[PDB]
Amino acid sequence: DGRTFVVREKQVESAYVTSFVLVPADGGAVLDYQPGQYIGIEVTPEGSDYREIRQYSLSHASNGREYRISVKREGVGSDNPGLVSHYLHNNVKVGDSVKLYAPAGDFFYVERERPVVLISAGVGATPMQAILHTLAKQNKSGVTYLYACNSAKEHTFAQETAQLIAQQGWMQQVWYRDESADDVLQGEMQLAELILPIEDGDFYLCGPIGFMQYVVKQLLALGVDKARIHYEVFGPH
Amino acid sequence: RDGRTFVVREKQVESAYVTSFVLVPADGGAVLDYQPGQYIGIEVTPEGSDYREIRQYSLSHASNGREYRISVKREGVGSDNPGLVSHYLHNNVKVGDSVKLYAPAGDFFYVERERPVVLISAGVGATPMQAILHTLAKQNKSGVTYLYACNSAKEHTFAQETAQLIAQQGWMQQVWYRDESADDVLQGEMQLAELILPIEDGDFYLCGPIGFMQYVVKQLLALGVDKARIHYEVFGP
Ligand SMILES: Cc1cc2nc3c(=O)[nH]c(=O)nc-3n(C[C@H](O)[C@H](O)[C@H](O)COP(=O)(O)OP(=O)(O)OC[C@H]3O[C@@H](n4cnc5c(N)ncnc54)[C@H](O)[C@@H]3O)c2cc1C
Numbered sequence: 274d275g276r277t278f279v280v281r282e283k284q285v286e287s288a289y290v291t292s293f294v295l296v297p298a299d300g301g302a303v304l305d306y307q308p309g310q311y312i313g314i315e316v317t318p319e320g321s322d323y324r325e326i327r328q329y330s331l332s333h334a335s336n337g338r339e340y341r342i343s344v345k346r347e348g349v350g351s352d353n354p355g356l357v358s359h360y361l362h363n364n365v366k367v368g369d370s371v372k373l374y375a376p377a378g379d380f381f382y383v384e385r386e387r388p389v390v391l392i393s394a395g396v397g398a399t400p401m402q403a404i405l406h407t408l409a410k411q412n413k414s415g416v417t418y419l420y421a422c423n424s425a426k427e428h429t430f431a432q433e434t435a436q437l438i439a440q441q442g443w444m445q446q447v448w449y450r451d452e453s454a455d456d457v458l459q460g461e462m463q464l465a466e467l468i469l470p471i472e473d474g475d476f477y478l479c480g481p482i483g484f485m486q487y488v489v490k491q492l493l494a495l496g497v498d499k500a501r502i503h504y505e506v507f508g509p510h
Numbered sequence: 511r512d513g514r515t516f517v518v519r520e521k522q523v524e525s526a527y528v529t530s531f532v533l534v535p536a537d538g539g540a541v542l543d544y545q546p547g548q549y550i551g552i553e554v555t556p557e558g559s560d561y562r563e564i565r566q567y568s569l570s571h572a573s574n575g576r577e578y579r580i581s582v583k584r585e586g587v588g589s590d591n592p593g594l595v596s597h598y599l600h601n602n603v604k605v606g607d608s609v610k611l612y613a614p615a616g617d618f619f620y621v622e623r624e625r626p627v628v629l630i631s632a633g634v635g636a637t638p639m640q641a642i643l644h645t646l647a648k649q650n651k652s653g654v655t656y657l658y659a660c661n662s663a664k665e666h667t668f669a670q671e672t673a674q675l676i677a678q679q680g681w682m683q684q685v686w687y688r689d690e691s692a693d694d695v696l697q698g699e700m701q702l703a704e705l706i707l708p709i710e711d712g713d714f715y716l717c718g719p720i721g722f723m724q725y726v727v728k729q730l731l732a733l734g735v736d737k738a739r740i741h742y743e744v745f746g747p
């Protein structure tokens with residue numbers, strides 16, 4: 274069964290986000306993909322009669338050996354705690370297996386030899402992470418990384434991203450909505466007071482719709498043509 | 511005073527409530543040696559930011575002079591008083607973040623006596639036992655039995671890592687789940703009477719909450735184990 278993958282690592286990325294490194298158990302194989310794309314993960318949650326399938330963006334660069342995805346605990350401390358995300362967080366240990374369906378998706382980086390801007394918030398960072406590592410392996414110049422999250426504790430991939438930015442000589446800017454920090458802006462992401470490649474860059478977007486629709490209308494306005502704005506949605510939320 | 515600044519290199523989920531932290535000195539250079547079974551101290555200042563808090567955490571890997579791993583149970587989940595330091599570490603201390611760490615100490619640790627070795631623990635009691643397993647693996651020790659009790663599959667700390675060691679070293683293990691059955695585990699309380707064990711010659715090392723400790727020590731004595739061959743450390747609650 275080529276779908277059977279085992280969890281080799283389970284890393285906490287932030288307060289609500291945990292990563293899973295997955296490898297074939299039963300003779301499957303790690304297929305190539307473009308950064309931005311997703312795989313389907315199938316598990317059978319506790320109590321539940323049924324198998325359940327959810328999509329998760331690859332969060333690292335394609336290497337043919339292992340996949341990484343990064344899962345937000347959805348609906349935490351709420352009326353309806355997300356079914357698959359909680360099961361993954363609470364029950365799927367290193368050494369446990371899941372069934373996995375091959376990479377696919379309409380959203381992915383395309384090399385156009387132009388500047389690149391990655392913008393995300395919250396768990397929308399996941400496909401941006403795959404793109405960052407890919408660009409890093411390609412020694413792409415002209416990369417800007419713009420990221421928003423509620424606070425330091427929800428700052429997903431903070432260290433990993435910072436090392437990459439410094440190593441490749443890129444630039445980044447982070448906003449914490451709910452508190453202040455050094456080199457961090459406080460509040461919602463504000464894109465007027467900083468240097469962006471508006472005329473020629475490609476702008477890649479991923480986050481809650483509210484966060485995005487805001488910034489999608491914002492770039493249309495700033496002169497960027499819609500053909501240069503690319504975005505992913507984790508469903509209609 | 512505080513001891514010394516370390517940085518979280520890795521944050522791995524071990525089970526539903528236990529998360530490991532791999533810590534390296536912010537200095538660089540060697541960290542103090544220790545005996546498997548000993549603990550370090552962690553000190554932080556929780557989001558209720560008045561005072562610092564210090565807690566003992568057991569080393570859960572073999573000593574190697576370069577980094578420390580500890581494994582921390584989220585205490586008091588679902589209670590009126592979720593444990594301050596454990597929740598702070600789980601929720602706020604990310605990879606790349608730093609903590610203050612005190613040097614290894616403690617009177618409970620493995621001593622080579624060329625006897626068969628029994629390791630017995632429950633829940634997070636497994637943490638120092640993990641340092642001991644790794645040390646004995648390194649030393650090619652033969653005649654090791656690992657006995658472990660936890661509530662269920664989702665709380666089965668180090669399940670994969672321990673299975674691998676055992677499969678690599680030719681050792682023996684038995685696992686008990688208090689609240690459910692599973693393939694090749696016993697359901698219920700750890701009962702020793704019917705196990706093949708080196709009662710006359712073995713060293714018995716025990717770690718876990720006091721109630722479990724009292725329960726196991728009474729069984730050991732009734733079976734005929736000399737008190738001088740029972741070594742133990744209590745932490746709970
Ligand atoms: C292309 C794609 C990529 C994705 N990538 C990622 C990723 O990288 N990381 C990641 O963590 N998640 C990602 N998701 C979201 C993921 O697929 C799941 O929908 C999510 O994990 C929730 O599933 P669940 O079973 O936990 O919650 P469910 O039990 O299915 O539903 C949770 C509850 O909240 C509402 N809800 C349902 N889905 C969502 C949602 N996605 N967001 C907010 N509220 C919701 C529902 O009405 C439901 O009542 C992606 C989704 C898509 C389509």
Ligand SMILES: Cc1cc2nc3c(=O)[nH]c(=O)nc-3n(C[C@H](O)[C@H](O)[C@H](O)COP(=O)(O)OP(=O)(O)OC[C@H]3O[C@@H](n4cnc5c(N)ncnc54)[C@H](O)[C@@H]3O)c2cc1C
Pocket residue numbers: 549563565566567568569580581582583584585586589591592593594595596597616634637638743744745746747
């Ligand atoms: C030698 C040794 C080794 C140890 N090794 C480990 C290890 O490897 N891993 C590990 O996870 N832990 C270990 N511990 C235990 C650990 O040091 C902590 O005691 C534990 O993490 C709890 O700390 P906390 O700050 O999270 O909880 P605390 O906040 O100290 O709470 C302690 C208990 O008191 C209750 N409580 C707190 N406040 C109140 C209040 N206002 N009213 C009523 N009740 C309250 C809490 O619910 C909790 O049950 C070890 C302890 C010792 C002595």
Ligand SMILES: [Cl-]
Pocket residue numbers: 345394395396397481
């Ligand atoms: Cl989010």
Ligand SMILES: [Cl-]
Pocket residue numbers: none
């Ligand atoms: Cl919110």
Ligand SMILES: [Cl-]
Pocket residue numbers: 606607608
């Ligand atoms: Cl820090």
Ligand SMILES: [Cl-]
Pocket residue numbers: 621
């Ligand atoms: Cl001695």
Ligand SMILES: [Cl-]
Pocket residue numbers: 632633659660661688
């Ligand atoms: Cl138990």
